[PDB]
Amino acid sequence: MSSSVPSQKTYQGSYGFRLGFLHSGTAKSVTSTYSPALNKLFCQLAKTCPVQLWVDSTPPPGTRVRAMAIYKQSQHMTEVVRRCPHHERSSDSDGLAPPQHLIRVEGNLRVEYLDDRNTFRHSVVVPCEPPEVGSDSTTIHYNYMCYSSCMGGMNRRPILTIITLEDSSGNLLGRDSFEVRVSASPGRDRRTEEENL
Ligand SMILES: *CCC(=O)n1c2ccccc2c2cc(C=O)ccc21
Numbered sequence: 077m078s079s080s081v082p083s084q085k086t087y088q089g090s091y092g093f094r095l096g097f098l099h100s101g102t103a104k105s106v107t108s109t110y111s112p113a114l115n116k117l118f119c120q121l122a123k124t125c126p127v128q129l130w131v132d133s134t135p136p137p138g139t140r141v142r143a144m145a146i147y148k149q150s151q152h153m154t155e156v157v158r159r160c161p162h163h164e165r166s167s168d169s170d171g172l173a174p175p176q177h178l179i180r181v182e183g184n185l186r187v188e189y190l191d192d193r194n195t196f197r198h199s200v201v202v203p204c205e206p207p208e209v210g211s212d213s214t215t216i217h218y219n220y221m222c223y224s225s226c227m228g229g230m231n232r233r234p235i236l237t238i239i240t241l242e243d244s245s246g247n248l249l250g251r252d253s254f255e256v257r258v259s260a261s262p263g264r265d266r267r268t269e270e271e272n273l
Pocket residue numbers: 129130131132133134135139204205206207212213214
């Protein structure tokens with residue numbers, strides 16, 4: 077699909093940018109859970125996934141935090157990741173996300189969606205906001221709108237989520253990522269995938 081492949085080099089940058097996650101466990105009723113051993117997130121479709129951000133020092137004002145997805149295996153990394161024909165046309169859009177965009181940010185009125193005219197890649201970016209009073213990290217609530225097994229979509233192809241911090245003018249301050257598997261039963265899948273280890 078695309079003419080380039082985005083760099084995935086994890087890079088902490090001058091502010092020590094990194095991502096954190098909750099310790100949800102693999103109970104049968106969790107809406108998302110992170111496998112530290114897989115560095116892979118297991119979640120349901122369109123259910124809320126909180127991701128935390130951490131920095132050490134003060135970043136410049138007007139900073140924006142952007143998410144993107146790319147297929148994991150070397151032979152698929154140029155295909156743009158998008159919702160499958162069925163899901164794209166499900167008319168459950170929230171009123172902001174492009175109906176073909178896989179990743180939504182939930183509960184933020186300053187979200188921004190981009191279809192990249194040269195890479196053709198979809199991405200969602202929001203403003204960077206400091207941790208609530210008392211807290212020490214920033215939580216962003218993401219959603220994934222297709223199952224990993226969607227034919228015509230990923231079709232069971234693993235994917236990475238690449239989160240990049242950028243300044244107001246759009247330049248890179250740090251990057252981090254993780255793989256993702258979307259299914260209806262994320263606790264059991266996480267359990268089983270760690271077993272196979
Ligand atoms: C863009 C969010 C932000 O400005 N921010 C965060 C986010 C998450 C964890 C910590 C943290 C900050 C810490 C400081 C000062 O040390 C300044 C801005 C921070």
